Design an enzyme around this catalytic site. Structure first.
Site, PDB file in Angstrom:
ATOM      1  N   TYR A  54      -7.589-109.413  78.726  1.00 32.49           N
ATOM      2  CA  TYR A  54      -8.525-109.983  79.701  1.00 32.49           C
ATOM      3  C   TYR A  54      -7.892-110.196  81.098  1.00 32.49           C
ATOM      4  O   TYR A  54      -8.559-110.027  82.107  1.00 32.49           O
ATOM      5  CB  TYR A  54      -9.244-111.225  79.140  1.00 32.49           C
ATOM      6  CG  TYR A  54      -8.450-112.504  79.224  1.00 32.49           C
ATOM      7  CD1 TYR A  54      -8.403-113.226  80.391  1.00 32.49           C
ATOM      8  CD2 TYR A  54      -7.799-113.019  78.109  1.00 32.49           C
ATOM      9  CE1 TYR A  54      -7.684-114.442  80.474  1.00 32.49           C
ATOM     10  CE2 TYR A  54      -7.101-114.196  78.157  1.00 32.49           C
ATOM     11  CZ  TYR A  54      -7.027-114.906  79.351  1.00 32.49           C
ATOM     12  OH  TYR A  54      -6.339-116.089  79.400  1.00 32.49           O
ATOM     13  N   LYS A  99      -4.601-127.182  85.879  1.00 32.80           N
ATOM     14  CA  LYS A  99      -4.875-125.809  86.322  1.00 32.80           C
ATOM     15  C   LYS A  99      -5.775-125.083  85.310  1.00 32.80           C
ATOM     16  O   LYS A  99      -5.359-124.883  84.152  1.00 32.80           O
ATOM     17  CB  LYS A  99      -3.551-125.074  86.440  1.00 32.80           C
ATOM     18  CG  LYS A  99      -3.702-123.618  86.851  1.00 32.80           C
ATOM     19  CD  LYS A  99      -2.393-122.919  86.772  1.00 32.80           C
ATOM     20  CE  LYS A  99      -2.563-121.447  87.097  1.00 32.80           C
ATOM     21  NZ  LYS A  99      -1.293-120.700  86.841  1.00 32.80           N
ATOM     22  N   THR A 119       4.568-117.332  87.012  1.00 37.06           N
ATOM     23  CA  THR A 119       5.401-116.896  85.893  1.00 37.06           C
ATOM     24  C   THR A 119       6.769-117.602  85.754  1.00 37.06           C
ATOM     25  O   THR A 119       7.458-117.381  84.779  1.00 37.06           O
ATOM     26  CB  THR A 119       5.614-115.352  85.929  1.00 37.06           C
ATOM     27  OG1 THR A 119       6.170-114.964  87.184  1.00 37.06           O
ATOM     28  CG2 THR A 119       4.282-114.601  85.721  1.00 37.06           C
ATOM     29  N   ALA A 175       3.190-124.218  89.288  1.00 37.17           N
ATOM     30  CA  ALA A 175       2.140-124.046  88.292  1.00 37.17           C
ATOM     31  C   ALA A 175       2.716-123.468  87.020  1.00 37.17           C
ATOM     32  O   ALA A 175       3.829-122.931  87.012  1.00 37.17           O
ATOM     33  CB  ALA A 175       1.013-123.141  88.830  1.00 37.17           C
ATOM     34  N   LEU A 194      16.058-118.361  87.485  1.00 37.68           N
ATOM     35  CA  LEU A 194      16.251-117.469  88.630  1.00 37.68           C
ATOM     36  C   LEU A 194      17.513-116.616  88.540  1.00 37.68           C
ATOM     37  O   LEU A 194      17.534-115.514  89.095  1.00 37.68           O
ATOM     38  CB  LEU A 194      16.192-118.257  89.945  1.00 37.68           C
ATOM     39  CG  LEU A 194      14.763-118.440  90.480  1.00 37.68           C
ATOM     40  CD1 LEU A 194      13.867-119.135  89.458  1.00 37.68           C
ATOM     41  CD2 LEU A 194      14.802-119.218  91.783  1.00 37.68           C
ATOM     42  N   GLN A 214      -6.994-119.366  72.817  1.00 34.13           N
ATOM     43  CA  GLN A 214      -6.623-119.542  74.207  1.00 34.13           C
ATOM     44  C   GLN A 214      -6.832-121.028  74.601  1.00 34.13           C
ATOM     45  O   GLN A 214      -7.963-121.518  74.694  1.00 34.13           O
ATOM     46  CB  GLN A 214      -7.472-118.639  75.105  1.00 34.13           C
ATOM     47  CG  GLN A 214      -7.195-118.810  76.636  1.00 34.13           C
ATOM     48  CD  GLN A 214      -5.846-118.324  77.036  1.00 34.13           C
ATOM     49  OE1 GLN A 214      -5.589-117.110  77.017  1.00 34.13           O
ATOM     50  NE2 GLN A 214      -4.960-119.238  77.394  1.00 34.13           N
TER      51      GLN A 214
HETATM   52  N1  LIG Z   1      -1.406-115.635  78.914  1.00 36.05           N
HETATM   53  C1  LIG Z   1      -0.890-116.917  79.479  1.00 36.05           C
HETATM   54  C2  LIG Z   1      -0.958-116.873  81.004  1.00 36.05           C
HETATM   55  C3  LIG Z   1      -2.337-116.880  81.622  1.00 36.05           C
HETATM   56  C4  LIG Z   1      -3.520-116.763  81.008  1.00 36.05           C
HETATM   57  N2  LIG Z   1      -4.547-116.832  81.933  1.00 36.05           N
HETATM   58  C5  LIG Z   1      -3.991-117.031  83.170  1.00 36.05           C
HETATM   59  C6  LIG Z   1      -4.586-117.194  84.389  1.00 36.05           C
HETATM   60  C7  LIG Z   1      -3.785-117.354  85.473  1.00 36.05           C
HETATM   61  C8  LIG Z   1      -2.389-117.399  85.350  1.00 36.05           C
HETATM   62  C9  LIG Z   1      -1.799-117.263  84.130  1.00 36.05           C
HETATM   63  C10 LIG Z   1      -2.609-117.057  83.008  1.00 36.05           C
HETATM   64  C11 LIG Z   1      -1.623-118.098  78.896  1.00 36.05           C
HETATM   65  O1  LIG Z   1      -2.454-117.870  78.016  1.00 36.05           O
HETATM   66  O2  LIG Z   1      -1.418-119.256  79.253  1.00 36.05           O
END
Ligand SMILES: N[C@@H](Cc1c[nH]c2ccccc12)C(=O)O
Ligand SMILES: N[C@@H](Cc1c[nH]c2ccccc12)C(=O)O
Lengths: 499, 498
Positions: B441, B69, B343, B41, B332, B150
């Site tokens: 958030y 996702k 991540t 992911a 890694l 976002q």
């Molecule tokens: N801050 C990152 C990662 C992230 C935001 N919301 C998430 C929810 C789940 C996992 C990762 C994230 C982004 O905006 O993409």
């Protein structure tokens, strides 16, 4: 829930607090403001708009009554090369291929001022343009500083006394009880909390939360509760000022910006109001006397005008260790103050008030909430303190004892890494002061590059990259500049249309 | 100027590096990649990388068995059977307070259902795009720093296929591919890497070396003696077992990753176009690999011994410095945490984007190198704190593992954050203060989802008119209703772009 707030002291800090509380809470809070009878122009941040919008006020209502003008940024002059200047604008740097225009300017720019190349605001200021067309259109509700998204392109110059009077009318209209009186004693209860303020003519005024807006006096926060004031005199020695009101002969000389002009032993503000400038020389009395500073000021801005009266002031520079002690919160000069080199006074009051609503106490007072408030307020001032010291360190002039002493003076802890980094490459979001202090990365970069803290070379990545996108953006900036100055009216022209 | 870059290792890390360098510098850099001969992911911000490269998702996503996702579903971390979503969605703000604060004051419907469109999108298994391709809500050459709004979704994909795709992109743009084993990594008298010695292609020399060798750390650790800081003391999960499970019913495809708390760790479910990837991340101090595989199989594919389990040992932590001399670790080799917040690709992307920003000259400025190391360290350390908060927020206490989680040491910066969180919600000024891929958030959503909730709501709210907030809650519900009726399913939209 608590019920009542007593604000001690009026002026900008008192009446911003009173108006804001009523706008936030309306008739779910009781507010009394006690101010004494025994009591110039100022600038703001672009972000003051959140405050005014929160209250529901439009600039066409108040700005003319308050002798107002528009501020597009600050012109810094004579800090380094004699007679050279640059602007610190309300405008972010554009980003081309992952690097901001300042990084590109180091690689492919015309090494005239950085600000002329990188910002529209530079050329708007040179042409003395208003930020609005005659029809009111901009050239580019209840929210707080945290909601700043796009950089709003202007701020205000105004007579702050008139603004405070205007806000007092608003606050009183909304149910604030106004008491004009002197506080003779501040009463405490057995826990050392404030129980009431004892007045000459209105007896004891009591409430749940006390707000100290008594200025440098700190009557509640320092004189009663024993708050420790931390002086910044070791790093920022300027301790006095002398100011003049200078009527403007020619209306079209009105500048849409604040000027900060380096002087022999400090620096001078010029704040353009509608129909006059306010001029003030901020200085350290270690290097010049009040009489000499008055003489230098007069020679510079009003030669032969002994009709114009000078006003002398002494400043308390620093911050309290904590601005919220027990049931008392300091707002304004009682809490902290730095010299107005980057127009931070109103901002310090606004952030303190907005965060006071955010951290407002319940009937069960919360030491954890209070600690978070105190941390936020300390970070705010400490960040600005570091930023201000970088002005004195970046200035290249060394022609007087003052300026020689600026070079070798002590400095804040964090500022060594920043100066180290800035010799190599530009500061960025991760390496400037990391907590909210009212400035972003572009402001730090702009002052460094304008004054002359420049990286030794450009970022090596840029030599591997196609310069065409950046060159094209520099061209866009010049062209947009050209168009805007031909289209917009002058600062005076627009203000005159709304009087 | 330096001239040449040698990447040791392929996979996602190597080929992301190779492709980004050529995207960034074109013919002003020589690049060679040397390499030996399930599902993942991403963050929503991986779009900055793909757009920089000039790729459109309709090209590559189908070839990489891809899915969409909208966030992560956290299940069974606290009350049995309860769950919530961590979305790619910011909280709305009314009268200066975010919807989480208002939810505490005038809410109680779970926090995530009341506050995020994403919750009901996920429940209804919607795609984030209409069949005409329109988003429900090109960056050109930009980086993570240019994230503004976002963006509402990220990807699930077969990372091996993404690597293959990128390898083709990179080789087409002039990257020299060498398939061989490294026998020796040469060093000069200063300890700087001089070249890599291969079995059949001789010495491959360059100016800058990128270590993409994974947990091995062949350059950064084994050759240069870089110190690795383990996180096992605060994050003890050290192994994983994974299974690929073909999906019988297409319409079961979820537009989100699931993180399901298990007896001695947690399980990921990553939906790809025709199968789910499932993996149990665990600590071998608390359950054996044999027991872990049994628990995974019973949970997602009982009686499917036709499906092969893959067992992995993880190296959890970070290099103290990811850039030493003329060697930079990416992936890694540099650092790794369990994929509880997806991540892995983000750590690669940030390291690569910052390598371009901190790219060396012939003087090899140590201040520039120092700055890069500091950024990389804060990136992982911030994620470290955020992850430990997951384990501290989790309320379940039913097995030795979960009991141990309650009393285990934590990073020192977390105590303050927990003390604050008992009183009021964290904010921009009280989460981890340096860039670490997550915003306010995310911190508060995990807290409120898991159960670290303020004792009482913000006192200021009781003095304020609640109508505006109640109206916004109502807008969120109604917008949700409209969107679930209008949008296609996750599977339907993906079928439509194959
Ligand atoms: N801050 C990152 C990662 C992230 C935001 N919301 C998430 C929810 C789940 C996992 C990762 C994230 C982004 O905006 O993409
Ligand atoms: N960051 C603040 C203050 C600020 C920005 N640019 C400036 C230029 C001069 C003085 C203050 C500022 C704002 O956006 O308003």
């Amino acid at each position: 829930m608590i019920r009542s707030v007593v604000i001690v002291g009026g002026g900008t800090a008192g009446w911003m607090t009173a108006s804001y509380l009523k706008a936030a809470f309306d008739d779910r809070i009781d507010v009394t403001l006690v101010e004494s009878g025994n009591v110039v122009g100022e600038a703001t941040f672009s972000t003051v708009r959140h405050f005014f919008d929160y209250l529901g006020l439009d600039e066409r209502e108040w700005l003319p009554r308050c002798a107002g003008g528009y501020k597009l940024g600050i012109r810094f002059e004579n800090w380094s090369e004699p007679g050279e200047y640059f602007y610190h604008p309300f405008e972010r740097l554009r980003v081309v291929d992952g690097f901001n225009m300042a990084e590109w300017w180091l690689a492919v720019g015309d090494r005239t001022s950085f600000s002329e190349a990188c910002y529209l605001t530079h050329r708007l200021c040179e042409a003395k343009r208003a930020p609005r067309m005659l029809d009111g259109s901009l050239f580019a509700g209840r929210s707080t500083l945290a909601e700043q998204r796009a950089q709003f392109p202007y701020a205000y110059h105004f007579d702050a006394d008139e603004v405070a009077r205007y806000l007092s009318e608003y606050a009183i209209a909304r149910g604030v009880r106004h008491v004009v009186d002197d506080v003779q004693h501040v009463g405490q209860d057995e826990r050392g909390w404030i129980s009431g303020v004892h007045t000459k003519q209105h007896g004891e005024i009591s409430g749940d939360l006390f707000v100290d807006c008594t200025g440098f006096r700190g009557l509640l926060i320092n004189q009663t509760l024993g708050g420790r004031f931390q002086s910044f005199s070791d790093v920022l020695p300027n301790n006095r000022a002398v100011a003049l009101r200078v009527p403007r002969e020619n209306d079209e000389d009105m500048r849409p910006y604040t000027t900060a002009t380096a002087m022999s032993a400090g620096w001078m503000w010029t704040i353009p109001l509608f129909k006059r400038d306010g001029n003030g020389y901020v200085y350290s009395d270690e290097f010049i006397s009040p009489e000499e500073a008055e003489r230098e000021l007069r020679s510079t801005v009003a030669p032969g005008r002994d009709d114009l009266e000078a006003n002398h002031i002494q400043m308390r520079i620093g911050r309290n260790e904590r601005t919220w002690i027990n049931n008392c919160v300091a707002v304004g000069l009682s809490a902290a103050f730095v010299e107005p080199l980057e127009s931070t006074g109103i901002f310090f009051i606004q952030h303190a008030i907005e965060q006071l609503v955010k951290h407002f106490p319940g009937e069960r007072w919360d030491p954890v909430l209070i600690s978070a408030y105190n941390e936020r307020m300390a970070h705010m001032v400490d960040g600005v303190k570091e930023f201000l010291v970088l002005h004195y360190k970046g200035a290249q002039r060394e022609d007087t004892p003052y300026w020689k002493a600026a070079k070798t003076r002590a400095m804040p802890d964090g500022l060594a890494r920043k100066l180290e980094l800035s010799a190599s490459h530009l500061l960025d979001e991760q390496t400037i002061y990391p907590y909210y202090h009212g400035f972003e990365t572009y402001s730090w970069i702009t002052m460094n590059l304008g004054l002359g803290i420049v990286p030794e070379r450009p970022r090596p990545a840029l030599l591997h990259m196609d310069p065409a996108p950046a060159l094209a953006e520099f061209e866009r900036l010049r062209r947009e500049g050209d168009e805007l100055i031909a289209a917009l009216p002058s600062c005076y022209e627009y203000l005159a249309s709304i009087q």
